[PDB]
Amino acid sequence: SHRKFSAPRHGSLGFLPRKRSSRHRGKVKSFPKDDPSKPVHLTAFLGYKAGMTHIVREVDRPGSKVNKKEVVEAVTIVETPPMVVVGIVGYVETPRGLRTFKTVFAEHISDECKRRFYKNWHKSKKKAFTKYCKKWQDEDGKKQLEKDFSSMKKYCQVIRVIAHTQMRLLPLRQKKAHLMEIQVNGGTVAEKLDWARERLEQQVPVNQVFGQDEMIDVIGVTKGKGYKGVTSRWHTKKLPRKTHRGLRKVACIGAWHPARVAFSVARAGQKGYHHRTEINKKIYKIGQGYLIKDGKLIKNNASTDYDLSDKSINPLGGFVHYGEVTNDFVMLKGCVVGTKKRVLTLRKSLLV
Amino acid sequence: EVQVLVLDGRGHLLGRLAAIVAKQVLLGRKVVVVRCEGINISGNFYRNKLKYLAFLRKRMNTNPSRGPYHFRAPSRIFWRTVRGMLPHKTKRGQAALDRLKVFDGIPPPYDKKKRMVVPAALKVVRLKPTRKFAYLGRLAHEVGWKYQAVTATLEEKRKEKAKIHYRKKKQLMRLRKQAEKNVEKKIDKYTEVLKTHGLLV
Amino acid sequence: MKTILSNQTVDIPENVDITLKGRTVIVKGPRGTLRRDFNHINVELSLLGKKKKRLRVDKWWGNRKELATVRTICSHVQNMIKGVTLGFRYKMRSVYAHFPINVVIQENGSLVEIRNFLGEKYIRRVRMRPGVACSVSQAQKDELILEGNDIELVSNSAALIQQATTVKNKDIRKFLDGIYVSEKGTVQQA
Amino acid sequence: SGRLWSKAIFAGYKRGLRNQREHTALLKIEGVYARDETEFYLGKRCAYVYKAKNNTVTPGGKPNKTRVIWGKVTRAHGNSGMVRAKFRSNLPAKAIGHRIRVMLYPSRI
Amino acid sequence: VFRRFVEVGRVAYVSFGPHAGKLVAIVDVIDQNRALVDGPCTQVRRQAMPFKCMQLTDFILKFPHSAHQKYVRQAWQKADINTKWAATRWAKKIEARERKAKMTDFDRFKVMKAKKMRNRIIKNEVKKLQKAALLK
RNA sequence: GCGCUGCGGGAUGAACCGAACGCCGGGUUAAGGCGCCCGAUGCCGACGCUCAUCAGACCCCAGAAAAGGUGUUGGUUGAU
RNA sequence: ACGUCGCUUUUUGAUCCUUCGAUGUCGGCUCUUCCUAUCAUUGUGAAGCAGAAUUCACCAAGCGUUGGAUUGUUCACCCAC
RNA sequence: ACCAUCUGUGGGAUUAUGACUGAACGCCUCUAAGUCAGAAUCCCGCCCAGGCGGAACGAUACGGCAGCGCCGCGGAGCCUCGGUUGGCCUCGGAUAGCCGGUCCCCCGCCGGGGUCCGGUGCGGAGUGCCCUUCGUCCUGGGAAACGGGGCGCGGCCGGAGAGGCGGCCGCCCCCUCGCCCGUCACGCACCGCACGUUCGUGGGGAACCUGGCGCUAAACCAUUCGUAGACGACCUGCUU
Ligand SMILES: COc1ccc(C[C@H]2NC[C@H](O)[C@H]2OC(C)=O)cc1
Ligand SMILES: [K+]
Ligand SMILES: [K+]
Ligand SMILES: [K+]
Ligand SMILES: [Mg+2]
Ligand SMILES: [Mg+2]
Ligand SMILES: [Mg+2]
Ligand SMILES: [Mg+2]
Ligand SMILES: [Mg+2]
Ligand SMILES: [Mg+2]
Ligand SMILES: [Mg+2]
Ligand SMILES: [Mg+2]
Ligand SMILES: [Mg+2]
Ligand SMILES: [Mg+2]
Ligand SMILES: [Mg+2]
Ligand SMILES: [Mg+2]
Ligand SMILES: [Mg+2]
Ligand SMILES: [Mg+2]
Ligand SMILES: [Mg+2]
Ligand SMILES: [Mg+2]
Ligand SMILES: [Mg+2]
Ligand SMILES: [Mg+2]
Ligand SMILES: [Mg+2]
Ligand SMILES: [Mg+2]
Ligand SMILES: [Mg+2]
Ligand SMILES: [Mg+2]
Ligand SMILES: [Mg+2]
Ligand SMILES: [Mg+2]
Ligand SMILES: [Mg+2]
Ligand SMILES: [Mg+2]
Ligand SMILES: [Mg+2]
Ligand SMILES: [Mg+2]
Ligand SMILES: [Mg+2]
Ligand SMILES: [Mg+2]
Ligand SMILES: [Mg+2]
């Protein structure tokens, strides 16, 4: 018979399965649509969740009760040292999807990037790309690389740069660099290759990818919680105290028929450490890293036009469980997924 | 007969072509079907779209991941039609099914091969001119096929190349008709032998 | 039954040139060129005469339904002959009780913006079909002139305007507000 | 040298729908798609030529991998050029869809 | 667009059936499916014959509908359809097919030797025209 | 008739349709079929009727009525 | 209205085919899914539709349909949103 | 922890319906052919997972004379799986129509269009075309001599949808045989008989010998980390 009282289902079936993410680094499942009219530009960036503080600002929202009034808004600090472009990858549109056409790497690869290629760097001979790099010097290699760039020019429709973070500038135990592909939008494919070739081995600051007052998306892996019951994983109503055999359960996991447990019923299992893509996280401040100017160290990235105090974004005593933020950072309104020290993928908005 | 039978799917009716293909793969005879997007289905489009939407509703209730797989590509739709016409739960049927290759558009290497039609399944032959029919390409595009535009772009490229090849053939054939007229005295006697036995008219 | 033969013949003015590419009809006249494709109807089109031309539509062995398209094609061709000689002029009138309907023409008759329909702050942007020019009448107020060569394009453009100004959630027997087609005519008078 | 035999496919065994008679085979011969065209092939020797692991004696040659099951076309089957054939041993089911050689002898033309 | 019409006097070539490969004249039309045909000079007596086995030719005789076979024969011989039909490429294509199916084993050998030679003389002249056009 | 009974057909099924049974070869059928599963129409089968945005599709048998249609196809009675 | 044709298995009956070397019985609670003969919400047609409100009908089950007093209650009834 | 705080989205075909043009039915008609607007529905996108599904790229095992790669279609032999018994190297498509070939105009030696001329039961035809196997000798005509044959060499161009293939040029060597019809005889002619003929120097697993060229790694465990965790798994660090 029908359930006496109507009630919404507990949880969303659009985030199934609730399994531990197969990847630790956030993956850009969809890059922004390419408008050839736009200038050549990167669409994503990698940052690290340092921690959260709060700000005070005046709101210009006509018709609101906070119009021309000051509010306190929580913000998240994402440390974004410049990324190094170490490769270009081309994609061809096929009736089976997008296919990796050709990959060209730069001549010089840092040990930060090279650590990504090894499970045990300590025991390795660090031979990765040792023979590949000679292509940039040998005459035969130079022609072969030019054939690759021309073939990518002629056949590829999607051009992406392979860039890596600089883990040496971060206060983390990890020295292995997170590498990712960042799509290059704008311009023609020929302009994409010309633009990407110049950036090879170069650094790209975060302020060249994102701007002030921009709605961006944050992609990353949520905080892991381990094995969780239905009460915590799916937020099902707790059963009465008198319940025998335990009460942190779902009482009925299905009708007699169909004679199988359905996939839509709440079950115990892994909670957290799920890949997620939150959107419309506004950029409040693109902070500058510590700078050495004419002998002295400039670190007043937390000073505003109304609080001229010479202080850094670092809270007194440093960010808890993260460290000190000395590089460029992005101040995002609200919270984002992941623990402290979690690598986050910052993507431009897919929407208008 | 040929080792591999390459069939152009354009202008053909889905079920009629599937019946012919299913028999051939059961008799050995590796078959390759191309341009499955060009396959037609009898009846107006909306009726056929309703039929396939009704197919999407069939999912295992307890676990749709195990339930029927709704393949959106015109190639896979035709492939599933053929599978329904085979004993695909036996080794004989499975081996027969492996002998069939289906492609949307004409991929290499079959784009530079002569493609054969099946007049018993051709729409111009099997359907009255006043009956409505549906295109498998449009039907698939509206049930979740993503690569209608990419296939259409690549097919236009292939057709450009095939016309250059045809212009070359017409040039070569015009020259061969010129060649025969020049050397007609030297091949007169050989021409009569062909004419005597009906090899020429 | 299946009738053996059913044909209707349409005359052609001396200033009009019609060429046939199979079932495609190309009509050329002083006002321009109109092309229509009739590949969806299995009929035979022929041109008769040399000093004065004449188009004939033939249908062999058709059922009752196939029989009906013979006059349909002939009427379509006569409309095309009308379009390239005299054109089509669909006059629309704006009817309003209280709030006047303000129509401004943009992009040389290609975009029609309708304002203050029923007092709404919503501006209606209606895009004319290609080859159709909309204008505001100068002789009489509250009147729009739609001019084009294809009756179907001109009339569909008028239909788009008419259904743009639709009263909702109100008794439409009262609230007779909108822009309505008042006259169907030709740019030139014979 | 040349083919000297006609190509045929072991389509399957004589059968209804739920009963199979393995002592009789059904053959499809290329070029023969009408019943009236099967009269040439009636009585012709049929061979299922396959290979195994062990060597077996070869008439007029050295032992090799090749083995043959010998048969003969017995009658036409249906209206579509199929023929019935009986082989000295019942054809193995693995041969369905494979090649059967239809010889040109015993000749009567 | 049509050029060949079923009418009284139209000469049709029978494709299949008892009289396959013969010419007949349409004497009258029974209904939409059958016509009254009569080949007096082609050894096909007057009888009904469906349009499905008839292939219209470009020959029309002048005699009134349902006329006696005598007047059909007179018109057939007056226009002399038999020789005119034989002169057409349609008939020549037919007789070429009969010859080709009639080829004995020796004839097939002789035709092939002629093919190994004629196609080869044509091939060289084609190559010469390739080279001549390239220079020009 | 089933029960006591297999077998061909009816997808499947105690009763339906054919037919009742030693172990086999050849031939031919019944009821039932012959697009493909799946043996057989791969006949240049015959004459129509029907378009369904819930078409229809074979005893038992496994879905439908009153009522209505200016859909279409025949036919009846009148009338100009 | 008098008549008359139906559909459903959400009531009760009728029957006794299955289960008596046993298929745990009412109600609630918890939870999922499904049906539509749609209460609301999206798009609409009609009115004895001036507006507002309301009623009838169509596409339509995507989404929602609650907090309590009495009662073991299903069902009722009332308070309030 | 709504007991604090942040974020939640774009298309498409269309339903109902309302229409356009328009016959059936000289009028009319949203429908018959044709066409338009159209929604919490539907399908896709966004988002979650990622096939007994692919892709691109890196590094590929040393003082042992070891392991390996590639070439030399290098030499044999072995075990093991067998199927097959010439090729077709491609316009687009129309079907109440189509195909081929030319003289003029414009897109720039192209291509398109307008005439004109042929073909159309498709003969510039898949009911088709191509190739062809007995070999050799003597010997004469044709045909050819702008010729054949060589992972023989080097170079160039084209092909990315799954290119995994195709063509051209330069040179060197070699033969003037190759293909039609003739002269001339010979080959085990194995004494009527089956699995013969081909792809093919087939695919696979090894174990040798042989010459040249080329390479000297990483994974896992253990340890550590705690962005992770029931255990596995997962993120990390380990002489600049
Ligand atoms: C009056 O309500 C009831 C009467 C009987 C039963 C039990 C039976 N139901 C089916 C079986 O025959 C038997 O089940 C068992 C385990 O004995 C349950 C409720
Ligand atoms: K319930
Ligand atoms: K043997
Ligand atoms: K019981
Ligand atoms: Mg409910
Ligand atoms: Mg994606
Ligand atoms: Mg208790
Ligand atoms: Mg879905
Ligand atoms: Mg999907
Ligand atoms: Mg109201
Ligand atoms: Mg209005
Ligand atoms: Mg008993
Ligand atoms: Mg008895
Ligand atoms: Mg019995
Ligand atoms: Mg049975
Ligand atoms: Mg049944
Ligand atoms: Mg028997
Ligand atoms: Mg019978
Ligand atoms: Mg059956
Ligand atoms: Mg069969
Ligand atoms: Mg009543
Ligand atoms: Mg009971
Ligand atoms: Mg029990
Ligand atoms: Mg029991
Ligand atoms: Mg139980
Ligand atoms: Mg309760
Ligand atoms: Mg309903
Ligand atoms: Mg629901
Ligand atoms: Mg109580
Ligand atoms: Mg909360
Ligand atoms: Mg829309
Ligand atoms: Mg109208
Ligand atoms: Mg409508
Ligand atoms: Mg629309
Ligand atoms: Mg062999």
Side-chain angles (χ1 to χ4, degrees), chain B residues 104 114 142 161 166 186:
Chain B
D104 302 299
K114 204 81 183 286
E142 296 193 16
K161 289 172 190 172
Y166 189 65
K186 279 143 84 180

PDB file of all heavy atoms in Angstrom, chain B residues 104 114 142 161 166 186, chain H residues 13 89 100 144 160-161:
ATOM      1  N   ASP B 104      29.367   4.361 -38.418  1.00  0.00           N
ATOM      2  CA  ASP B 104      28.627   5.588 -38.790  1.00  0.00           C
ATOM      3  C   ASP B 104      29.566   6.330 -39.724  1.00  0.00           C
ATOM      4  O   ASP B 104      30.749   6.371 -39.409  1.00  0.00           O
ATOM      5  CB  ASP B 104      28.316   6.432 -37.556  1.00  0.00           C
ATOM      6  CG  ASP B 104      27.515   5.674 -36.525  1.00  0.00           C
ATOM      7  OD1 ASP B 104      26.401   5.262 -36.863  1.00  0.00           O
ATOM      8  OD2 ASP B 104      28.026   5.482 -35.410  1.00  0.00           O
ATOM      9  N   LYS B 114      34.631  -0.238 -53.200  1.00  0.00           N
ATOM     10  CA  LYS B 114      33.305  -0.212 -53.797  1.00  0.00           C
ATOM     11  C   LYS B 114      32.283  -0.728 -52.795  1.00  0.00           C
ATOM     12  O   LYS B 114      32.473  -1.783 -52.185  1.00  0.00           O
ATOM     13  CB  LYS B 114      33.276  -1.052 -55.070  1.00  0.00           C
ATOM     14  CG  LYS B 114      32.182  -0.652 -56.034  1.00  0.00           C
ATOM     15  CD  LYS B 114      32.598   0.554 -56.845  1.00  0.00           C
ATOM     16  CE  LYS B 114      31.485   1.006 -57.762  1.00  0.00           C
ATOM     17  NZ  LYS B 114      31.330   0.084 -58.917  1.00  0.00           N
ATOM     18  N   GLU B 142      18.464  12.600 -31.743  1.00  0.00           N
ATOM     19  CA  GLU B 142      17.448  13.131 -30.801  1.00  0.00           C
ATOM     20  C   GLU B 142      17.226  12.190 -29.621  1.00  0.00           C
ATOM     21  O   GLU B 142      16.389  12.526 -28.784  1.00  0.00           O
ATOM     22  CB  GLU B 142      16.130  13.381 -31.524  1.00  0.00           C
ATOM     23  CG  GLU B 142      16.233  14.452 -32.589  1.00  0.00           C
ATOM     24  CD  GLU B 142      14.893  14.934 -33.107  1.00  0.00           C
ATOM     25  OE1 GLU B 142      13.877  14.664 -32.446  1.00  0.00           O
ATOM     26  OE2 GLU B 142      14.869  15.569 -34.170  1.00  0.00           O
ATOM     27  N   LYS B 161      36.927  14.429 -51.391  1.00  0.00           N
ATOM     28  CA  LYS B 161      38.018  13.612 -51.907  1.00  0.00           C
ATOM     29  C   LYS B 161      37.524  12.642 -52.969  1.00  0.00           C
ATOM     30  O   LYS B 161      38.188  12.436 -53.990  1.00  0.00           O
ATOM     31  CB  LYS B 161      38.694  12.860 -50.765  1.00  0.00           C
ATOM     32  CG  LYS B 161      39.515  13.741 -49.853  1.00  0.00           C
ATOM     33  CD  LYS B 161      39.990  12.966 -48.642  1.00  0.00           C
ATOM     34  CE  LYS B 161      40.609  13.883 -47.609  1.00  0.00           C
ATOM     35  NZ  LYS B 161      40.908  13.147 -46.355  1.00  0.00           N
ATOM     36  N   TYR B 166      36.835  10.659 -58.710  1.00  0.00           N
ATOM     37  CA  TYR B 166      35.906  10.429 -59.844  1.00  0.00           C
ATOM     38  C   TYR B 166      36.263  11.284 -61.067  1.00  0.00           C
ATOM     39  O   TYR B 166      36.150  10.784 -62.184  1.00  0.00           O
ATOM     40  CB  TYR B 166      34.455  10.629 -59.407  1.00  0.00           C
ATOM     41  CG  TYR B 166      33.457  10.201 -60.450  1.00  0.00           C
ATOM     42  CD1 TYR B 166      33.354   8.873 -60.823  1.00  0.00           C
ATOM     43  CD2 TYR B 166      32.630  11.120 -61.073  1.00  0.00           C
ATOM     44  CE1 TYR B 166      32.451   8.462 -61.787  1.00  0.00           C
ATOM     45  CE2 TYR B 166      31.717  10.726 -62.034  1.00  0.00           C
ATOM     46  CZ  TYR B 166      31.632   9.394 -62.396  1.00  0.00           C
ATOM     47  OH  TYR B 166      30.735   8.995 -63.340  1.00  0.00           O
ATOM     48  N   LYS B 186      44.712  -1.510 -85.319  1.00  0.00           N
ATOM     49  CA  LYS B 186      45.572  -2.527 -84.736  1.00  0.00           C
ATOM     50  C   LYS B 186      44.828  -3.496 -83.830  1.00  0.00           C
ATOM     51  O   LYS B 186      45.377  -4.551 -83.493  1.00  0.00           O
ATOM     52  CB  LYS B 186      46.708  -1.866 -83.953  1.00  0.00           C
ATOM     53  CG  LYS B 186      47.855  -1.407 -84.829  1.00  0.00           C
ATOM     54  CD  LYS B 186      48.437  -0.099 -84.343  1.00  0.00           C
ATOM     55  CE  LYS B 186      49.459  -0.328 -83.252  1.00  0.00           C
ATOM     56  NZ  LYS B 186      50.031   0.953 -82.764  1.00  0.00           N
TER      57      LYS B 186
ATOM     58  P     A H  13      14.935  22.540 -32.820  1.00  0.00           P
ATOM     59  OP1   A H  13      15.157  23.036 -34.198  1.00  0.00           O
ATOM     60  OP2   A H  13      14.323  23.429 -31.807  1.00  0.00           O
ATOM     61  O5'   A H  13      14.068  21.212 -32.915  1.00  0.00           O
ATOM     62  C5'   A H  13      14.552  20.089 -33.628  1.00  0.00           C
ATOM     63  C4'   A H  13      13.803  18.836 -33.261  1.00  0.00           C
ATOM     64  O4'   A H  13      14.105  18.454 -31.895  1.00  0.00           O
ATOM     65  C3'   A H  13      12.292  18.932 -33.278  1.00  0.00           C
ATOM     66  O3'   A H  13      11.735  18.882 -34.574  1.00  0.00           O
ATOM     67  C2'   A H  13      11.891  17.773 -32.382  1.00  0.00           C
ATOM     68  O2'   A H  13      12.037  16.538 -33.062  1.00  0.00           O
ATOM     69  C1'   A H  13      12.970  17.856 -31.306  1.00  0.00           C
ATOM     70  N9    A H  13      12.531  18.692 -30.177  1.00  0.00           N
ATOM     71  C8    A H  13      12.650  20.048 -30.034  1.00  0.00           C
ATOM     72  N7    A H  13      12.144  20.507 -28.921  1.00  0.00           N
ATOM     73  C5    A H  13      11.652  19.377 -28.294  1.00  0.00           C
ATOM     74  C6    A H  13      10.993  19.188 -27.072  1.00  0.00           C
ATOM     75  N6    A H  13      10.706  20.177 -26.229  1.00  0.00           N
ATOM     76  N1    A H  13      10.633  17.934 -26.737  1.00  0.00           N
ATOM     77  C2    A H  13      10.921  16.942 -27.582  1.00  0.00           C
ATOM     78  N3    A H  13      11.535  16.993 -28.757  1.00  0.00           N
ATOM     79  C4    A H  13      11.877  18.254 -29.057  1.00  0.00           C
ATOM     80  P     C H  89      37.792  -2.144 -54.222  1.00  0.00           P
ATOM     81  OP1   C H  89      38.350  -3.222 -53.374  1.00  0.00           O
ATOM     82  OP2   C H  89      36.328  -1.929 -54.272  1.00  0.00           O
ATOM     83  O5'   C H  89      38.479  -0.779 -53.794  1.00  0.00           O
ATOM     84  C5'   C H  89      39.862  -0.557 -54.044  1.00  0.00           C
ATOM     85  C4'   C H  89      40.091   0.730 -54.791  1.00  0.00           C
ATOM     86  O4'   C H  89      41.463   1.157 -54.584  1.00  0.00           O
ATOM     87  C3'   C H  89      39.898   0.652 -56.301  1.00  0.00           C
ATOM     88  O3'   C H  89      39.460   1.922 -56.773  1.00  0.00           O
ATOM     89  C2'   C H  89      41.316   0.400 -56.795  1.00  0.00           C
ATOM     90  O2'   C H  89      41.542   0.768 -58.138  1.00  0.00           O
ATOM     91  C1'   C H  89      42.123   1.259 -55.830  1.00  0.00           C
ATOM     92  N1    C H  89      43.509   0.817 -55.641  1.00  0.00           N
ATOM     93  C2    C H  89      44.539   1.702 -55.960  1.00  0.00           C
ATOM     94  O2    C H  89      44.248   2.824 -56.399  1.00  0.00           O
ATOM     95  N3    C H  89      45.819   1.312 -55.783  1.00  0.00           N
ATOM     96  C4    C H  89      46.080   0.095 -55.305  1.00  0.00           C
ATOM     97  N4    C H  89      47.359  -0.252 -55.146  1.00  0.00           N
ATOM     98  C5    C H  89      45.046  -0.825 -54.970  1.00  0.00           C
ATOM     99  C6    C H  89      43.784  -0.426 -55.149  1.00  0.00           C
ATOM    100  P     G H 100      28.006  11.047 -65.182  1.00  0.00           P
ATOM    101  OP1   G H 100      29.170  10.800 -64.312  1.00  0.00           O
ATOM    102  OP2   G H 100      27.149  12.231 -64.948  1.00  0.00           O
ATOM    103  O5'   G H 100      28.528  11.062 -66.687  1.00  0.00           O
ATOM    104  C5'   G H 100      29.363   9.994 -67.176  1.00  0.00           C
ATOM    105  C4'   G H 100      29.386   9.970 -68.686  1.00  0.00           C
ATOM    106  O4'   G H 100      28.031  10.010 -69.204  1.00  0.00           O
ATOM    107  C3'   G H 100      30.035  11.161 -69.370  1.00  0.00           C
ATOM    108  O3'   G H 100      31.467  11.189 -69.321  1.00  0.00           O
ATOM    109  C2'   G H 100      29.471  11.054 -70.783  1.00  0.00           C
ATOM    110  O2'   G H 100      30.146  10.155 -71.636  1.00  0.00           O
ATOM    111  C1'   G H 100      28.047  10.564 -70.510  1.00  0.00           C
ATOM    112  N9    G H 100      27.083  11.657 -70.576  1.00  0.00           N
ATOM    113  C8    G H 100      26.398  12.240 -69.539  1.00  0.00           C
ATOM    114  N7    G H 100      25.633  13.226 -69.921  1.00  0.00           N
ATOM    115  C5    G H 100      25.835  13.306 -71.292  1.00  0.00           C
ATOM    116  C6    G H 100      25.274  14.184 -72.254  1.00  0.00           C
ATOM    117  O6    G H 100      24.462  15.100 -72.083  1.00  0.00           O
ATOM    118  N1    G H 100      25.756  13.917 -73.531  1.00  0.00           N
ATOM    119  C2    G H 100      26.661  12.933 -73.844  1.00  0.00           C
ATOM    120  N2    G H 100      27.009  12.836 -75.133  1.00  0.00           N
ATOM    121  N3    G H 100      27.189  12.109 -72.957  1.00  0.00           N
ATOM    122  C4    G H 100      26.735  12.350 -71.710  1.00  0.00           C
ATOM    123  P     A H 144      52.368  -0.832 -81.243  1.00  0.00           P
ATOM    124  OP1   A H 144      51.481   0.280 -80.823  1.00  0.00           O
ATOM    125  OP2   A H 144      52.959  -0.829 -82.604  1.00  0.00           O
ATOM    126  O5'   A H 144      53.550  -0.943 -80.185  1.00  0.00           O
ATOM    127  C5'   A H 144      53.272  -1.012 -78.795  1.00  0.00           C
ATOM    128  C4'   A H 144      54.496  -1.390 -78.004  1.00  0.00           C
ATOM    129  O4'   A H 144      54.948  -2.707 -78.406  1.00  0.00           O
ATOM    130  C3'   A H 144      55.715  -0.506 -78.205  1.00  0.00           C
ATOM    131  O3'   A H 144      55.667   0.682 -77.439  1.00  0.00           O
ATOM    132  C2'   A H 144      56.861  -1.431 -77.824  1.00  0.00           C
ATOM    133  O2'   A H 144      56.974  -1.531 -76.413  1.00  0.00           O
ATOM    134  C1'   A H 144      56.357  -2.767 -78.361  1.00  0.00           C
ATOM    135  N9    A H 144      56.852  -3.044 -79.720  1.00  0.00           N
ATOM    136  C8    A H 144      56.183  -2.883 -80.905  1.00  0.00           C
ATOM    137  N7    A H 144      56.887  -3.224 -81.956  1.00  0.00           N
ATOM    138  C5    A H 144      58.098  -3.637 -81.421  1.00  0.00           C
ATOM    139  C6    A H 144      59.276  -4.120 -82.012  1.00  0.00           C
ATOM    140  N6    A H 144      59.431  -4.276 -83.325  1.00  0.00           N
ATOM    141  N1    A H 144      60.300  -4.444 -81.198  1.00  0.00           N
ATOM    142  C2    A H 144      60.143  -4.288 -79.879  1.00  0.00           C
ATOM    143  N3    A H 144      59.087  -3.844 -79.205  1.00  0.00           N
ATOM    144  C4    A H 144      58.089  -3.532 -80.046  1.00  0.00           C
ATOM    145  P     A H 160      43.799  13.427 -44.323  1.00  0.00           P
ATOM    146  OP1   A H 160      42.392  13.874 -44.300  1.00  0.00           O
ATOM    147  OP2   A H 160      44.873  14.423 -44.517  1.00  0.00           O
ATOM    148  O5'   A H 160      44.074  12.611 -42.987  1.00  0.00           O
ATOM    149  C5'   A H 160      43.239  11.499 -42.636  1.00  0.00           C
ATOM    150  C4'   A H 160      43.255  11.304 -41.144  1.00  0.00           C
ATOM    151  O4'   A H 160      44.591  10.958 -40.728  1.00  0.00           O
ATOM    152  C3'   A H 160      42.852  12.528 -40.318  1.00  0.00           C
ATOM    153  O3'   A H 160      41.654  12.271 -39.597  1.00  0.00           O
ATOM    154  C2'   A H 160      44.022  12.760 -39.356  1.00  0.00           C
ATOM    155  O2'   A H 160      43.599  12.971 -38.026  1.00  0.00           O
ATOM    156  C1'   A H 160      44.797  11.448 -39.432  1.00  0.00           C
ATOM    157  N9    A H 160      46.232  11.624 -39.236  1.00  0.00           N
ATOM    158  C8    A H 160      47.016  12.668 -39.658  1.00  0.00           C
ATOM    159  N7    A H 160      48.277  12.551 -39.322  1.00  0.00           N
ATOM    160  C5    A H 160      48.324  11.352 -38.625  1.00  0.00           C
ATOM    161  C6    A H 160      49.378  10.662 -38.006  1.00  0.00           C
ATOM    162  N6    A H 160      50.639  11.098 -37.986  1.00  0.00           N
ATOM    163  N1    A H 160      49.091   9.487 -37.403  1.00  0.00           N
ATOM    164  C2    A H 160      47.827   9.051 -37.424  1.00  0.00           C
ATOM    165  N3    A H 160      46.752   9.609 -37.971  1.00  0.00           N
ATOM    166  C4    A H 160      47.072  10.773 -38.562  1.00  0.00           C
ATOM    167  P     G H 161      40.302  12.989 -40.026  1.00  0.00           P
ATOM    168  OP1   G H 161      39.990  12.582 -41.412  1.00  0.00           O
ATOM    169  OP2   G H 161      40.422  14.426 -39.701  1.00  0.00           O
ATOM    170  O5'   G H 161      39.231  12.344 -39.044  1.00  0.00           O
ATOM    171  C5'   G H 161      39.561  12.026 -37.682  1.00  0.00           C
ATOM    172  C4'   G H 161      39.001  10.676 -37.303  1.00  0.00           C
ATOM    173  O4'   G H 161      37.749  10.453 -38.001  1.00  0.00           O
ATOM    174  C3'   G H 161      39.875   9.483 -37.645  1.00  0.00           C
ATOM    175  O3'   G H 161      39.556   8.417 -36.772  1.00  0.00           O
ATOM    176  C2'   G H 161      39.365   9.079 -39.017  1.00  0.00           C
ATOM    177  O2'   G H 161      39.556   7.697 -39.171  1.00  0.00           O
ATOM    178  C1'   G H 161      37.872   9.344 -38.871  1.00  0.00           C
ATOM    179  N9    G H 161      37.199   9.684 -40.119  1.00  0.00           N
ATOM    180  C8    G H 161      37.661  10.506 -41.117  1.00  0.00           C
ATOM    181  N7    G H 161      36.811  10.650 -42.096  1.00  0.00           N
ATOM    182  C5    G H 161      35.720   9.882 -41.718  1.00  0.00           C
ATOM    183  C6    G H 161      34.490   9.647 -42.379  1.00  0.00           C
ATOM    184  O6    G H 161      34.105  10.082 -43.470  1.00  0.00           O
ATOM    185  N1    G H 161      33.666   8.808 -41.639  1.00  0.00           N
ATOM    186  C2    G H 161      33.984   8.260 -40.423  1.00  0.00           C
ATOM    187  N2    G H 161      33.059   7.470 -39.869  1.00  0.00           N
ATOM    188  N3    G H 161      35.129   8.467 -39.798  1.00  0.00           N
ATOM    189  C4    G H 161      35.943   9.283 -40.498  1.00  0.00           C
TER     190        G H 161
END
